[PDB]
Amino acid sequence: EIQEAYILSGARTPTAKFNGSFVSVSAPELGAVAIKSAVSKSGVPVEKITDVYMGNVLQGAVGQAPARQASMFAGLSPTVESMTVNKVCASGLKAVALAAQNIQLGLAEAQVAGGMENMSRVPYYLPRSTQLPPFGEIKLQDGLIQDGLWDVYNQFHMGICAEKTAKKYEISREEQDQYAIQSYQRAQAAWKENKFAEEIAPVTVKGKKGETVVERDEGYENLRIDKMATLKPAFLRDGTGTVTAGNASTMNDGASALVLGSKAIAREFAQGNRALARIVSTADAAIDPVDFPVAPAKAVPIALERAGITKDQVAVWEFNEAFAAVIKANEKILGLQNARVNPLGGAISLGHALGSSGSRILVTLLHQLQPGEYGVAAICNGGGAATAMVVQKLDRV
Amino acid sequence: EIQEAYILSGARTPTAKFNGSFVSVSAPELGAVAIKSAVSKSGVPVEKITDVYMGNVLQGAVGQAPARQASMFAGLSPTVESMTVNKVCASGLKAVALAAQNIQLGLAEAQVAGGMENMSRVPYYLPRSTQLPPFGEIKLQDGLIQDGLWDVYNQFHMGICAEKTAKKYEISREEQDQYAIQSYQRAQAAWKENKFAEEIAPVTVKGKKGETVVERDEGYENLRIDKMATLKPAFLRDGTGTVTAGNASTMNDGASALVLGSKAIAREFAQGNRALARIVSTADAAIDPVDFPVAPAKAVPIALERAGITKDQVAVWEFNEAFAAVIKANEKILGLQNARVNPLGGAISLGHALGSSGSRILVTLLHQLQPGEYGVAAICNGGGAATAMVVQKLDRV
Amino acid sequence: EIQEAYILSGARTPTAKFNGSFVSVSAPELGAVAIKSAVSKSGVPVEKITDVYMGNVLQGAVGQAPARQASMFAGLSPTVESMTVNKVCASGLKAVALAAQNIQLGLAEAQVAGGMENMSRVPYYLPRSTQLPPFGEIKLQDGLIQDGLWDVYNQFHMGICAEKTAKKYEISREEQDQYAIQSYQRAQAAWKENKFAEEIAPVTVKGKKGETVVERDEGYENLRIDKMATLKPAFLRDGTGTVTAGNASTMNDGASALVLGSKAIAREFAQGNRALARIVSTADAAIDPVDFPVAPAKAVPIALERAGITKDQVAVWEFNEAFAAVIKANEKILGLQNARVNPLGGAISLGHALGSSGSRILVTLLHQLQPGEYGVAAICNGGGAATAMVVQKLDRV
Amino acid sequence: EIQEAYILSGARTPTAKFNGSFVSVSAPELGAVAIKSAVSKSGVPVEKITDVYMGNVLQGAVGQAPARQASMFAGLSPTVESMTVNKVCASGLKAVALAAQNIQLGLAEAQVAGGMENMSRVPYYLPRSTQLPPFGEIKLQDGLIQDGLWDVYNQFHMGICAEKTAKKYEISREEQDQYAIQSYQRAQAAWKENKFAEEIAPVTVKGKKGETVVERDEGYENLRIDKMATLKPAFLRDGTGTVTAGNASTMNDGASALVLGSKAIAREFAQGNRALARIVSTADAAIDPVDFPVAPAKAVPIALERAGITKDQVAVWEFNEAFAAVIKANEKILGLQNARVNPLGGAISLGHALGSSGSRILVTLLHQLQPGEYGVAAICNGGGAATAMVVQKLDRV
């Protein structure tokens, strides 16, 4: 009596630059535009949707119950339950898996899930009087670094963890800069062909002078293939530095949302749906924190097993491009050198709104699968962990 | 083939006052102490536990992946997966349901779940350069208020939500103070008889020169019956105010954790476990944000329906005492005036560490049920929601 | 045996915009530039100069002993004594008076004196732990407001003081806005003909890529004659308001410095010096804090009396344009609507670096005086006071 | 033509501990209390007093025109002119020398002058948006440290300057501790005989429980002769260090004020005055910033020559006890190791309100001279400078 869960629809905001277009738009406002567009496209009447689960990594100053904000700003009923989920970078995918579980268990027939992040709006932390010294210099941490990008156990940046997977699998500066230039080109190629028009939910940002409609990603046109090899290593300055701002993910503001359904709900409302797919399997996996870059290589086989398919049976892989080194290490271990991996670009060129990325790569995946094809979305997360989902694209049922 | 999920064991830190015994101990350090104790008391080999789900509502400056830190500081393997959950005050119960689902779907045989909050260590928020005015006065938000206790939709304290439920259900200042007084007395009674010794995991605070072992809830000895009628309203000062510091929960630091298992794991390892129980059902439910106080009245029936039991079959009820007004309104609507609700005290007297409280009431519940008895934990949460769990205490499986 | 004191030099930095070209350049580093130039142009060997007195009304985060910093950055010997003076907006004129007094008493034969402010660099104030509340919202004062522009006794902006001087002496919105347009045109006319080239000392700003040389006042171009009449009252928002951002002075970053000498030093080194003049008198005067705008009307008569001259003998008046309402009020009381007041514009168009403006309007006066002419510099200051100096331009002796 | 100036009265507040009795009382309120007393003991009719000059080193968040605030809170007329003077630690004595100059030129007949500092109330500095990085950790400077106690040129504490002076003049840990023990003992002797009753103006602190009258210095009782030789160096902690919290100035809150008069005003109203004295000479001197400790040794001879007296004609020396090492070094250079130096204690035991201390030592010096005796107040200040005043105590004329 374990049931099956279907993706009926998917939408994402454009991915804006750090301190760019979405500075005045909170993560839940971004969530709201992704959820409004997902429910519209699902063909499901809003009253069947009973829960909104949204990933959000940096919750500081977002106000009470971020997920609940997104739900309410999307115009959903106050009767719809909600939850903000933090599996760091995996938050968005994990949220989709949690919503699927509600359907798999018979507890609900329709769900919305995804993620959201406004990195521009994460704040600095001032401790209260009892945790301040009585005199002398105070250091205030940036939430982006202390909560987002700093390993607790080995007290260094995620960038250093990548440096140590880059050496252990012999992934050079040149190999990394090659993958990054290719991510930028695939993104430019996909935008010229307009491959993101149907998944994208435009954000109307207000203001004093204007009203601007943002409908295009920000940062994918910034490729200077000249400069890329001329960049300093951003994290390791002991001579052996290979990760740079060029060949790593950028910080971004953005959101993404999907509507999920039972077999019954998919049949009645979703048969022609463009993003219609079965959730075949999900899997989480963890190893040592420093080794978070290769966690996906642990999660993917568990997911493939639970789906009873081989690697060769998945048409498209979407792995989140945290760092070029991450993709190349994971390509090596799973033997995916000639697989379709991030064909339209990834987080190096399209951006990384942390809480959203897990569900944004799923939205991108579903739009580039043919009927009957298996897809895989996998994303690594800080602390040494990863979430992978197997999806089968469908025309009906 | 939906499997059954069993609580094998349960522990909680003491609940320390705001700016007290735990200012130096981060929420995940507190988490690790409750987890260490729960796994130890479970009798399950540590390698069979595959996931740690911790509730935590105010994640600011806790550092990356708060639940991951709790799991590692507990000595659990880096192979153990984690996720930190934010359903505001319901976070800790929701985390237990989420872990139960892993077992129900056959994805794991043993879990740890619970919650943690250090309200002392919640920072103030300073926005970055791009959100600050060029000149003129700046307001820094506390963070306890902006993220914890401030409604986004009606821009006012959770306390005003309590005031409106107090008027609507004609719950008097005197009725509130009388419940508050009873909460204090029940907590003093319980501490005199040492009724919390089994469930409490002492915390070792490495102080200035020496080291203090905390094993006693702080706050429950602070009843001044005489002064109770003359306390100022904390939130509403128009003459109609009824909710005070006296009849409201306090801010607190603490953590709580349980070990869950499959039938196979309980049989082989937990026969006769002191806190052994079946998770018979769970329910989430939501209504208008201002009516969050009464959301538990909507969830409890759904959870009783899914257990196939009636109110009268519930031996004891653990409802979170967010405000006296909350417990009285729920007692009215569900007709539980003559049922055993919060027999040993609650949040008014024993404290409210937001992210922990949902799992803290479950731990307290399990230690006061006889073999074969049914119990309900229920907890309201900001944005207008609640979750309720039905448990059946057991000698063996 | 009271000796006379003469002015031999006279320099000022360009007045940069708030958050303009000098954000990187500390008020002392600005002072040093204006000092280096004024000692160079004096002809006096640097070893004869024994003291540096500099105005600076906003000293927060400037570092130890601002005036000292100015002196040392200016290359002057550690043997030179310094003091930083705060008479709010009079600070710069006051420091010249006090340096003159050293010469008037026979304690020294050569002094540098003047003023400096970097309002861009004025900080916000965070109370230490003993003056912070244990929880809830904190207000951080700007300091441009709290220390700079806020009357202590009547808790309102210097702007409100001006409003009450604008009503009392019936000075209308249109009368203010006329004077402002007039000021803006006199500054353009002056810069077109390049009149400030002699008095300005260019500031080389060291940047991340190259070096910029700033030689031009920033803000005198910004006249939109039409928009002036539609600008909202800045300070008084009950309908009756007349004072605007446009008809008021701006916040600015700049410095000014003069070299003073004994008769003996003037004769031996400074005959036919461009700036050469005798300080014939000074006077300070104070009234009610709200009436600080009309305080130059109490100080100029006293200063004339001590000079032993009549109003109609003074060639050029330089009153600081703190507001348009100020200049007009003082034109009505002294009967100067028929005299040369601020011929080359003032603080409305040329800016207002608080601590510098006193000595700035002095340098600007000395450069537009012909031999044997009497000039008066006068400057109102917050708390209800003013400082007036009478000079006599000289070719020799 | 140059007159001479008379001290007619002298008052100070008790010197309160850092974060002690005056936390809630702003520097200008403390100045007001000291001014009220000095005016009241002057037996000058208030309206003859035309100017208030007060030292204040740390003006941040004190509000506009600190000296004006002291004047107005004292009850003096808005008629009265004011100025706040910043010569670091020499501020209060320089203020007295400036006010005298007004009398010595014939510009006034009666002046108030002194200093004030609330080091408890000095704030931390948050730069505005334009001087903050776009992301990453921020350091907030205390303000006591950055403006008060940090050398700009060398980038180290005023305590490191003392450590250099200590080693250059072979002043050992034991020698420094002996002077500090002696300072505490002399201060205890002076308090047991009530030798400060005449000069101390008690401060009334309004609380949220009642009123407190503070009449006694805080800190002079804290001597533990045992624990003094066991204290860790405070500023040089590499093992080389000699200066401790014990043998250095404390941080303190306090204020001090004298009334000054013409020969004509002394005669008509101050014959008999307890504190009555002539200002014989005043001198400022400057050397290398690291050498500030020894700047008094350069300033004293200049002040003596201008007084036309020799060292031996001085009954009592008050040198501000910034560091025990500062006193012992100047004693060596000037050959005053056997002279009457700080007989009733100093800043090491009696505290050190920066802006106040220069005039505080002057009022202490006046109350221990006999008629016809010469006294010297000398005080080193940050940036490598000092101010010395020579007075002659007088019973009349």
Numbering used by the authors:
A (entry chain B), B (entry chain A), C (entry chain D), D (entry chain C): 36 to 432
Give verbatim lines from the article:
In this study, we have characterized recombinant AfERG10A as a functional acetyl-CoA acetyltransferase catalyzing both synthetic and degradative reactions. Unexpectedly, AfERG10A localizes to the mitochondria in A. fumigatus, as shown by C-terminal green fluorescent protein (GFP) tag fusion. Both knockout and inducible promoter strategies demonstrate that Aferg10A is essential for the survival of A. fumigatus. AfERG10A consists of three domains, an N-terminal domain (residues Glu36 to Asn153 and Asn287 to Arg302), a C-terminal domain (residues Ala312 to Asp433), and a loop domain (residues Met154 to Met286).
